[PDB]
Design a protein around this ligand. Structure first.
Ligand SMILES: C/C=C(\C)CC/C=C(\C)CC/C=C(\C)CC/C(C)=C/CC/C(C)=C/CC/C(C)=C/C
Ligand SMILES: Nc1ncnc2c1ncn2[C@@H]1O[C@H](COP(=O)(O)OP(=O)(O)O)[C@@H](O)[C@H]1O
Lengths: 1033, 464, 232
């Protein structure tokens, strides 16, 4: 067969079963080939355009195409300049989505195929599918790279940028996903899907710096991604990666992400961990189940009700529809990943399930459903029954996305297109080539990470450069680097505000957020001058944390470690260590000189650095040319300000309570007799409330005297005042919100609120202004000094989660109020008889070392009362605690009741799977009402014991509800009785002795609990079991 | 930048190309002195590439498009090529660097001239008075500066450190001077010129501080006088100002500049030194030396060199100034070829008018002779123009902050450790109140005599 | 073993057994490591510079190279800007060779390692080895592509073009070859060698359209091959 004949076979299939359906007007392809539905889904059209483009990539290998390369390529442009049209008409929504990404502000993902108008509303359909905006951008890059000219003018480039500003913040926007439903439950709920974040990581890796004009392109046509927002997407995908979401431990939507088209994952071990779960738990004879417990077009599904009701998801176990398309993705993955026997294994699986149209053209049925009469037989022996196709093609129904993937897979498998041809941007990087790919891999490779960050020590004044030189550090003042301009990050945020600004489409520009450490680590050419930005770590702030130099030195180490772990761009990162004369004042000089000296030695924190002159460091380096600034409307270039040389009590005696019951002008009386900046903050902070923002003070408006006392004790390092001041003036840091996203991107949930007081749970990314109400009004209403300390711990924990993620393993809900409690207790145990120091008097850095010390793996040594109080307060769980609690719930008919909460076997067993993250949160909610933290550790231990008894002994099963509190009370009462027999302790209902008893030992806590559990289990039937049938019975 | 700053940058590009880069040899990268002088001086080559380096820096601070990157890269690589060519010129004379390192003799010094076509040697050692510590020192200084500006084997690093040792003992080494004639009498007498000492001090500072401060002592003692047989040399501007900045005494720099202005500055530039007579109508052109009785004849009629007024624009740019009188006074440029300034080497009193000039000093309308254009002077002219017109900054030509020399430096606090040799000695020191630590206690810090330190450096710089 | 240790093994071998010998002046490496022969063959220096560059390409996979990437790469540039020097001094011969390619008009292929001057004459040695001019150009393209900046000004680009005008007409210039003798018989005879024409086809395929300036390059730095001479 000639190539013409080999490829005329695909052109007949493409032209009949795909390009016949392309809208003559929009270019979008219709979801229903035959019918009056006017729905064109965004994802299915992209996969359809990719299928026509794959045939053009094949016809490019024939010079006498007879027009077929132009038509098949221009069909792909038609579909892609049709999705752009649908989005460009909804650009009122792209502006709203950048500012407020939400389910009801999104670009619609289903449009009228004929007109491009919105078809289904936000109520009718879940349009927040960022897999679609993100695959539009991956495919636009992959097609524009191929030679296909989809973007035509600067306004289309500005919309693609605004589309990018939206795809950057996906980590914080939960969505419905490729499957349009959200989770397995169709509750109408959006969740973060590895698949949507993974496609966004891939669109962003591909579109950073892509001339969207292609070869006919200049600097003003390039798209610019935020290295920091891309990192946040990489961080989210990797903390959800053997899995898909809180609901799905595996989904087959992971296969489109992990491999064609995105090829997103950059870890070969996670790719194998993710693929193996997808193949093992989702593969079928007729295809791959979209997700386990899936009700799509299942026989048992109710057609009329859109939303599955709780526990319905069980009815779909074994009846799950199997989509033959996933066999085609596995064949494309095999061609790309060089497995010539995974293409065959899955080709062999598809040849049987493939229907053929009347003319012989193959039809990939969308799904294969178990017929209703056979549902119970499949559920009984899954894989036994025969499932009917959903579309046979002769019916007039074709799955246009699957038809397109057949063309891509068959062409790739037959070697009529090459992996390189359909991945012009190299999304698949073979392992041997995983070395210098920007935003993904660094020269060192995939595994090695010893980056040398290029430090440049910049001094605020010549005075400070001459002072620093005398003490050993050569630094350069801002002027000594004359052509180079050192800018605050905020001045780049002002410049970027002019990127993507189209007034014709109502678009505004980069949202005004902070550029971070992976974007201030780049050299920029803005308006003809070279700009290097000082990191956000060096940005002055109202919060009192800035005053501790030790925290600055640590933020410098923490930033450089983030730059090492997460900078994968071509140049060496450039960290500029701005030194301000305030930083060396007093004894801050000795700590700063050691940091500055280590930066000179070449290592600060395990991060190798090369301090050198900026001119030498900026010399052959890649500079991001910010060409969007232009002159624009104003005939003047924007005005950008650059850092310039700055040329020259033991305890508060006044207690709040005894001095607030007084309303007296006498608080204003002691105010004149208080030298304590802590008594003043307490006295001049009672009055920011009772007398008002401006009640006149001797000094002046009260608002001015607390800000004077806060600032004054900030310098005098009087930390009780700085915290009473910050709280009384209700100070919140810019970084609380950026850090609370580290918790969220890492799968952790932060609770703010004190121990013993109203807690709140930030489970989803939130605005600085919503987070502020949660800390000063909603949660801490009794002491606001707690909000400043909790704000202090979120900043500390957030960098600890980023650089040392495992100091927080076994922690899923990080209760900052409980962690502060662990710290107040550590100060008492450390204190001894001598009174314990007040966490509040401790310096921001002393509060960080207390945290780091309490988080350190409890080692052999401390009282088992102290080990328990710290572990219980940190809410640390033994590894597999959550999996083990599933196993206890599976073998307990009526559930577990702890502290007046109840994990019932149903609806949880029916709606959830063993490793579901949703279950870990339900176990954590059940143990929520345990007020005492040492009791939480005993309850965590009873549950660990109940798991060993149940697992070691497979015959015993609980009859009634297990009341974990009663099993604990019976264990303490046995201990109480046995210890009484030793020495008759007269303390009653005091579990201090029980808590101090080691877990395992001669008579430890684990014996009492095993005994209690066994007495309960043995009071019920012992099921004869077959694994080790009884010998004496 | 192309609106009104790229066109002027291109104009300066034509200036440098048609004055300097047109004569660069594609094989070696060296610059012949002129059409008649086809050889390449080390100092003249180093100075003549300053305009190219400054243009490259200008082009780069505005290089975003390719074409501009191409021009910036071409200029920077031309500078690198010239310095590398001068390196192989010196590298071929490694046997002379090694010999001068120990025996600092004029017969064992690096040659000033080199064959611009082969990087070889044109004349014999005996034939030019090759010892010029300022040429090697200016090469080292600008090698340090260009590298600190981003312009890129270890064997040549060892050679460069051996050159550091070569110019290290310049405070006590007689020189043939920046004018390669030794003393004024002009009998080939090697003499210690502050120009060479200052340039060596600047090169060592940019690249052992003991000989650096020895050079500093020479500079303080000699200034405002140039050397033993010179009241003042206009080449001292290359020490008290750009490019060396080797004098940290502002009063001394001002006094040296005032001496130069009062004694040597004339209507057509500054005379190199009093009674120079390099191209005066009174000398014998075909006689190499000068009899001691004809030096009077050269008085008040010495040739004025426009090259030194480029130094007076450079300082004034390095140190901010209204010395826009040094510029606007350089209307004494040859062609306004097309309109190229072509800064002359010197102006000589027309021969007939010797008596009038003698009697009435700095008053006769002199003629231009010598090299035209003086590429060492032309490069400094272009650099000063660039710097003065805002296309360049002192911090780009001087990334090592050599300009900040004049600033008063604060007194230093010398930390001293009094260490006891023996513990008994430590006990006695303590009875008397000085609490110290023994040499054994100061471990792992090991105390050694300075002889060991001097012997250790004898293993620095060695490639066999 | 860490990568540093794995590659320090090669840096010790490269630095002792190859880069010790590189001429401090020309950059060319000597054919005889020990002795008074001053011959640096063109082909052997190119293969030596490629060896140092291969180690730099390896040390690029380590960020804390300790200077070894710059030195090993800049040693390769030294050898390649030293062969260019040897050829650029003999550019009276590049003009004569374009016009009359002949055994006695060729660029010499053995030069003084210390000075870059011609060592052996046309009678003493068969200098017509177009494997050498052609591997200079394949290696200049392969090294300039890597990030190694060997061509510095427009005049060096014009010489590389004139070097190309010579390498295009190799099909019609019979040569001595990599082996310097000509045929198996050392009759002093030049013959067309697939090896010399093959390296020329490769230099021409690589250098057509190549900015010799690399990334810092424009339209005026590109080399242009004749599609017709390459076909020949
Ligand atoms: C980190 C925590 C641990 C290592 C757990 C420590 C273990 C403890 C305290 C003991 C756990 C004991 C368990 C799980 C169970 C014991 C057995 C053997 C129970 C037998 C019950 C029974 C009546 C079985 C029937 C026997 C048959 C089948 C006869 C024919
Ligand atoms: N104060 C800060 N300290 C550290 N990183 C910050 C700070 N402010 C912003 N960033 C970083 O800047 C980037 C974008 O800022 P922002 O939109 O505030 O992020 P987020 O939404 O994740 O809080 C993120 O990488 C974020 O971590």
């Amino acid at each position: 067969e000639t190539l013409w004949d080999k490829l005329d076979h695909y052109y007949r299939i493409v032209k009949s079963t795909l390009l016949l359906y392309q809208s003559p007007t929009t270019g979008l392809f219709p979801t229903k080939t035959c019918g009056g539905d006017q729905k064109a889904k965004i994802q299915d059209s992209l996969y359809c355009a990719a299928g026509a483009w794959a045939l053009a990539l094949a016809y490019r290998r024939i010079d006498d195409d007879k027009g077929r390369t132009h038509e098949l390529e221009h069909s792909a442009i038609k579909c892609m300049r049709g999705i752009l049209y649908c989005y460009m008409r909804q650009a009122d929504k792209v502006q709203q989505f950048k500012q407020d990404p939400r389910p009801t502000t999104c670009l619609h993902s289903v449009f009228n195929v004929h007109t491009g108008d919105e078809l289904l509303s936000y109520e009718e359909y879940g349009h927040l599918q960022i897999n679609a905006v993100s695959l539009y951008l991956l495919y636009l890059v992959e097609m524009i790279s191929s030679g296909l000219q989809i973007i035509y003018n600067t306004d289309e480039v500005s919309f693609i940028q605004n589309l990018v500003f939206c795809v950057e913040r996906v980590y914080r926007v939960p969505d419905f996903g490729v499957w349009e439903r959200g989770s397995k439950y169709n509750n109408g709920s959006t969740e973060l899907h590895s698949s949507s974040v993974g496609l966004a990581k891939a669109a962003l890796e591909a579109i950073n710096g892509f001339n969207l004009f292609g070869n006919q392109g200049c600097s003003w046509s390039v798209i610019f991604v935020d290295l920091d927002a891309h990192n946040r997407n990489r961080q989210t995908l990797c903390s959800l990666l053997p899995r898909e979401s809180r609901s799905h431990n595996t989904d087959a939507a992971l296969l489109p992400c992990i491999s064609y088209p995105a090829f997103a994952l950059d870890d070969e071990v996670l790719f194998s961990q993710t693929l193996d779960k997808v193949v093992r738990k989702l593969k079928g004879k007729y295809g791959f189940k979209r997700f386990l417990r899936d009700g799509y077009r299942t026989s048992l599904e109710d057609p009329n009700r859109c939303y599955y009701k709780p526990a319905e998801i069980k009815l779909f176990d074994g009846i799950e529809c199997e989509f033959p398309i996933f066999f085609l993705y596995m064949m494309i993955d095999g061609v790309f990943r060089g497995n010539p026997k995974q293409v065959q294994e899955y080709q062999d699986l598809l040849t049987p399930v493939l229907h053929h149209t009347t003319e012989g053209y193959p039809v990939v049925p969308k799904y294969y459903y178990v017929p209703a009469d056979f549902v119970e037989y499949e559920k009984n022996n899954p894989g036994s029954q025969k499932r009917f196709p959903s579309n046979c093609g002769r019916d007039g129904k074709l799955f246009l996305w699957g038809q397109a993937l057949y063309i891509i897979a068959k062409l790739l498998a037959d070697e009529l297109i090459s992996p390189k041809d359909i991945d012009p941007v190299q999304r698949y990087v073979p392992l041997k080539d995983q070395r210098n790919v920007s935003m993904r891999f660094s020269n060192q490779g995939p595994l090695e990470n010893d980056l040398v960050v290029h430090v440049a020590l910049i001094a605020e004044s010549q005075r400070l450069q001459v002072f620093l030189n005398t003490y050993g550090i050569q630094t350069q003042t801002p002027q000594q680097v004359e052509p180079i301009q050192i800018w605050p990050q905020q001045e780049l945020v002002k410049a970027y505000l002019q990127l993507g600004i189209n007034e014709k489409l109502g678009l505004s520009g980069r949202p005004d957020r902070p550029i971070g450490c992976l974007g201030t680590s780049k050299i920029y050419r803005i308006l003809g001058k070279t700009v290097v930005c000082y990191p956000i770590i060096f940005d002055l702030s109202d919060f009192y944390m800035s005053q501790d130099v030790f925290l600055l030195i640590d933020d410098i180490k923490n930033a450089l470690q983030f730059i090492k772990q997460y900078w994968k761009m071509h140049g060496r990162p450039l960290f500029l260590v701005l030194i301000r004369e305030d930083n060396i004042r007093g004894s801050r000089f000795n700590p700063i000189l050691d940091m500055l000296a280590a930066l000179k030695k070449g290592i600060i924190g395990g991060v190798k650095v090369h301090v050198d002159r900026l001119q030498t460091l900026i010399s052959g380096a890649v500079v991001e040319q910010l060409d969007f600034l232009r002159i624009s409307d104003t005939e003047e270039l924007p005005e950008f300000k650059s850092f310039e040389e700055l040329e020259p009590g033991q305890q508060p005696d006044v207690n709040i309570s005894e001095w607030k019951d007084k309303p007296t002008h006498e608080i204003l009386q002691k105010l004149n007799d208080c030298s304590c900046l802590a008594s003043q903050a307490i006295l001049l902070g009672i009055l920011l409330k009772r007398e008002g923002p401006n009640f006149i003070t001797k000094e002046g408006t009260v608002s001015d005297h607390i800000e004077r006392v806060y600032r004054r004790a900030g310098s005098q390092k009087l930390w009780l005042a700085v915290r009473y001041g910050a709280a009384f003036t209700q100070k919140f840091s810019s970084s609380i919100a950026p850090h609370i996203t580290t918790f969220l991107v890492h799968g952790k949930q932060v609770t703010l609120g004190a121990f013993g007081h109203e807690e709140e749970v930030i489970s989803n990314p939130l605005s600085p202004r919503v987070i502020q109400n949660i800390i000063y009004y909603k949660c801490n209403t009794h002491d606001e000094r707690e909000a400043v300390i909790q704000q202090e711990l979120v900043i500390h924990i957030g960098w600890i989660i980023s650089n040392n993620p495992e100091l927080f393993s076994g922690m899923l809900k990080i209760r900052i109020g409980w962690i502060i409690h662990a710290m107040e207790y550590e100060l008492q145990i450390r204190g001894g008889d001598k009174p314990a120091l007040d966490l509040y008097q401790l310096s921001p850095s002393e509060v960080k070392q207390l945290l780091l010390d309490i988080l350190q793996p409890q080692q052999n040594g401390r009282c088992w009362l102290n080990r328990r109080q710290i572990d219980g307060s940190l809410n640390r769980t033994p590894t597999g605690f959550y999996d083990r609690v599933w196993q206890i719930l599976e073998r307990t008919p009526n559930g577990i009741i702890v502290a007046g909460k109840h994990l019932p076997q149903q609806p949880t067993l029916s709606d959830m799977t063993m490793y579901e993250m949703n279950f870990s949160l339900l176990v954590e909610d059940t143990l929520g009402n345990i007020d005492q933290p040492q009791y939480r550790q005993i309850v965590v231990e009873l549950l660990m014991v109940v798991s060993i008894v149940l697992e070691r002994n497979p015959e015993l099963e609980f009859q009634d509800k297990v009341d974990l509190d009663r099993l604990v009370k019976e264990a303490f009462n046995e201990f109480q009785k046995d210890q009484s027999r030793l020495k008759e302790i007269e303390k009653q209902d005091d579990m201090t002795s029980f808590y101090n008893t080691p877990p395992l030992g001669k008579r430890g806590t684990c014996s009492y609990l095993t005994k209690a559990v066994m007495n309960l289990l043995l009071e019920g039937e012992v099921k004869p079991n077959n694994d080790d049938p009884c010998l004496i019975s | 930048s192309r609106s009104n700053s790229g066109v002027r940058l291109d104009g300066y590009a034509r200036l440098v190309q048609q004055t300097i880069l047109c004569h660069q040899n594609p094989v070696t990268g060296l610059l012949p002195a002129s059409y008649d002088q086809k050889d390449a001086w080390v100092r003249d080559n180093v100075y003549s590439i300053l305009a190219v380096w400054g243009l490259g820096l200008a082009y780069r601070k505005n290089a975003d498009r390719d074409e501009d990157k191409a021009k910036a890269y071409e200029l920077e690589q031309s500078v690198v090529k010239l310095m590398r060519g001068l390196l192989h010129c010196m590298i071929r004379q490694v046997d002379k660097v090694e010999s001068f390192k120990y025996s600092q003799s004029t017969k064992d010094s690096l040659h000033a001239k080199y064959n611009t076509k082969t990087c070889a040697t044109v004349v014999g050692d005996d034939q030019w008075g090759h010892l010029q510590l300022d040429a090697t020192s200016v090469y080292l200084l600008f090698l340090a500066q260009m590298t600190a500006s981003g312009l890129h084997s270890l064997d040549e690093v060892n050679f460069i450190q051996n050159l550091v040792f070569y110019i290290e003992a310049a405070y006590k080494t007689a020189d043939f001077g920046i004018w390669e004639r030794g003393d004024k009498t002009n009998q080939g007498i090697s003499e210690l010129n502050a120009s060479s000492v200052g340039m060596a001090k600047a090169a060592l500072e940019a690249l052992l501080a003991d000989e650096v401060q020895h050079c500093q002592s020479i500079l303080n003692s000699l200034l405002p006088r140039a050397s033993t047989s010179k009241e003042v040399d206009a080449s001292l501007l290359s020490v008290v100002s750009f490019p060396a900045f080797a004098v940290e005494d502002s009063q001394l720099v001002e006094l040296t500049k005032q001496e130069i202005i009062t004694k040597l500055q004339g209507r057509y530039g500054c005379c190199r030194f009093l009674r120079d007579g390099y191209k005066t109508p009174k000398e014998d052109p075909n006689r190499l030396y000068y009899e001691p009785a004809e030096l009077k004849l050269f008085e008040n009629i010495e040739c004025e060199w426009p090259l030194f007024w480029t130094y007076f624009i450079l300082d004034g740019v390095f140190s901010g100034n209204a010395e826009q009188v040094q510029e606007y006074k350089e209307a004494l440029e040859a062609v306004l070829k097309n309109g190229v300034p072509l800064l002359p080497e010197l102006y000589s009193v027309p021969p007939d008018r010797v008596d009038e000039e003698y009697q009435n000093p700095h008053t006769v309308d002199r003629v231009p002779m010598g090299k035209l254009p003086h590429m060492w002077g032309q490069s400094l002219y272009i650099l000063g123009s660039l710097m003065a017109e805002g296309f360049l900054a002192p911090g780009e030509i001087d990334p090592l902050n050599r300009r900040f020399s004049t600033v008063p430096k604060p007194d230093v606090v010398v930390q001293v450790s009094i260490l006891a040799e023996t513990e008994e000695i430590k006990t006695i020191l303590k009875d008397k109140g000085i609490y110290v630590e023994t040499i054994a206690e100061v471990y792992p810090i090991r105390v050694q005599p300075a002889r060991i330190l001097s012997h250790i450096y004898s293993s620095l710089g060695c490639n066999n």
